[PDB]
């Protein structure tokens, strides 16, 4: 018995440090803590699969229980990135087969996943795979799904939201129905399945006592009546199809919703079917009206009934009128997303525009907001100012102004952005997407000056000249990922701003004063810095990121890797 050191106790304590950023530090205090963290780290996320080789991953963290890889750039969700760009999952599943023998959960986000790679994953991991998320992935088929549901007999959570695959049959669902007992969350929310049987889904409900969340494609809600009675513990449901016919005026009206349902979104729901929610609206904490067929008036009447709403996603039909309603009935609101609606033939109705009026109303009512993302038809410096004054502890704020309107009240937004960034000092993610007149070099510098905590930024049509990019670039102490499109800045200005930014590890840019020369981007050639061009086949894109691995082997023909003198 000698004086007990931290060393006599660190193996034990390390497993109580949960925060990824504290593990980060701990791994750096000395060779031993490095090794303990290495052997005990349970979860790792890779924001860009090309950032390191799978060998490196499994040497550093041999006992991962949970992995999450992202592939294609965010821009891919907006049809801006070629389908073949990259994000092949296959080296990662072979590494998982051989060296991550503890893995129980895999989340692939925006990646190419083939049937062969999911067959391998299924056989390698089998009963140990508790959760698989194919999140906005492509490249597989129902054969792959069948393979994982037959070999992974204990899957608790299985997700395919927004993935594109080839649907050959429905036996994957049937196979779950017949043998799976353990399913807690099943999610094919934003997917075309035409060969699966609602009976199978019902039988899954009947067999999976812990089934808490299910999201689904275009199933006729009436066909799910059995499912709803059987899903006793269901807390979340999204999807289905509400198809009214004049024939049955009360087609629905007799829905048994599980008594616990509190997070939901019924697709195509109209004003006539809306009322099946009233009986338990006091209970609803999450609402997804994103695919709803209801008008600005109808929004107000439903929102009004949901005092405990904390999450709302919806199209801009919500209108200023709707935001006013939300402003005083739902004081607990934490997250709001206003996507953009049918923007061709009138804004869906003559109230389906949100503006300064709504924003300022919202700022005053829902002061608990942590996430606010909004496609707005018109802004004013004043509204930004009130966001900044009233709703502190906003963590993620995104504003895009539509291109529909001709006149925008007052445009140069410099003084608004500036007070917004100053009041909301908890802000980690920030998107600001405008029109040319929108922000001046002076405002652009404000953004860089007053955003000490921002890790990610999407900048729209900001600034007037290179002066603005450069002034911006002397700020942003913590900017890690920067996405800019529709900006004027020149090749040498981009290059120079990248050089100045202390924390930058990812850059995606569309629209910039190019030059066939190419050679101006080169003035940011650092070691470990990969620059890729997607040529003007849409305007040229620049993708650049740090990587310990070197240049990817697997580029398409549409993507040119920039290296020193040609």
């Amino acid at each position: 018995s000698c004086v007990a050191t931290v060393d006599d106790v660190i193996e034990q304590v390390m497993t109580y440090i949960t925060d990824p950023k504290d593990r980060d530090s701990a791994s750096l205090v000395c060779r031993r803590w490095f090794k303990i963290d290495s052997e005990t780290r349970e979860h790792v996320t890779m924001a860009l699969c090309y950032t390191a080789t799978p060998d490196r991953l499994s040497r550093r963290f041999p006992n991962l229980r949970s992995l999450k890889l992202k592939g294609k750039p965010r821009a891919a969700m907006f049809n801006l990135i070629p389908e073949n760009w990259g994000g092949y999952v296959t080296p990662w599943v072979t590494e998982i087969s051989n060296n991550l023998r503890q893995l129980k959960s895999v989340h692939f986000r925006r990646m190419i996943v083939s049937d062969l790679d999911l067959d391998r994953l299924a056989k390698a991991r089998a009963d140990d795979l508790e959760t698989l998320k194919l999140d906005k992935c492509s490249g597989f088929t129902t054969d792959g799904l069948l393979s994982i549901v037959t070999h992974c007999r204990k899957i608790k959570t299985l997700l395919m939201e927004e993935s594109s695959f080839s649907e050959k049959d429905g036996k994957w669902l049937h196979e779950l129905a017949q043998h799976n007992t353990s399913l807690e969350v099943l999610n094919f929310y934003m997917t075309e399945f035409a060969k699966i049987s609602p009976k199978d889904l019902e039988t899954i409900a009947r067999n999976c006592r812990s089934l808490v969340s299910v999201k689904v494609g275009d199933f006729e809600i009436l066909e799910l009546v059995g499912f709803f009675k059987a899903a006793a513990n269901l807390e979340e449901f999204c999807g289905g199809s509400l198809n009214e016919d004049i024939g049955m005026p009360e087609k629905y009206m007799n829905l048994v919703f599980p008594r616990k349902l509190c997070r939901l979104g019924l697709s195509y729901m109209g004003p006539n079917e809306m009322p099946i929610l009233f009986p338990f609206a006091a209970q609803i904490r999450k609402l997804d009206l994103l695919y709803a067929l209801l008008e600005t008036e109808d929004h107000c009447t439903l929102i009004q009934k949901c005092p405990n709403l904390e999450v709302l996603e919806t199209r801009n039909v919500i209108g200023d009128r709707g935001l006013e309603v939300l402003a005083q009935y739902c004081k607990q609101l934490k997250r709001l997303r206003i996507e953009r609606g049918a923007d061709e033939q009138g804004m869906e109705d003559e109230e389906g525009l949100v503006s300064q009026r709504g924003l300022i109303a919202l700022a005053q009512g829902c002061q608990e907001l942590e996430y606010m993302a909004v496609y707005v038809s018109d802004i004013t410096n004043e509204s930004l100012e009130s966001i900044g004054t009233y709703l502190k502890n906003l963590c993620d704020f995104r504003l895009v102004l539509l291109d529909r309107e001709e006149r925008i009240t007052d445009l140069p937004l410099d003084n608004g952005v500036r007070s917004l960034l100053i009041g909301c000092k908890k802000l980690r993610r920030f998107a600001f997407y405008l029109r040319q007149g929108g922000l001046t070099d002076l405002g652009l510098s404000y953004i860089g000056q007053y955003s000490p905590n921002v890790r990610w930024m999407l900048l729209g049509y900001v600034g007037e000249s290179d002066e603005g990019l450069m002034e911006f670039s002397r700020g942003c102490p913590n900017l890690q990922k920067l996405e800019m499109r529709g900006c004027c800045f020149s090749e040498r200005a981009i290059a120079a701003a990248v050089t100045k930014l202390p924390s930058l590890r990812y850059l995606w840019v569309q629209g910039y004063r190019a030059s066939m020369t190419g050679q101006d981007l080169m003035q940011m050639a650092r070691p470990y810095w990969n620059i890729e061009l997607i040529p003007s086949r849409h305007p040229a894109h620049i993708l650049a990121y740090y990587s310990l691995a070197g240049q990817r082997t697997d580029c398409p023909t549409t993507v040119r890797v920039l290296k020193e003198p040609i």
Partner: peptide, 13 residues
């Protein structure tokens, strides 16, 4: 033009 609403804005009309 998000890829989830581009599918809907057409399943709508």
């Amino acid at each position: 033009r998000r890829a989830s609403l581009h599918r809907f804005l057409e399943k709508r009309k």
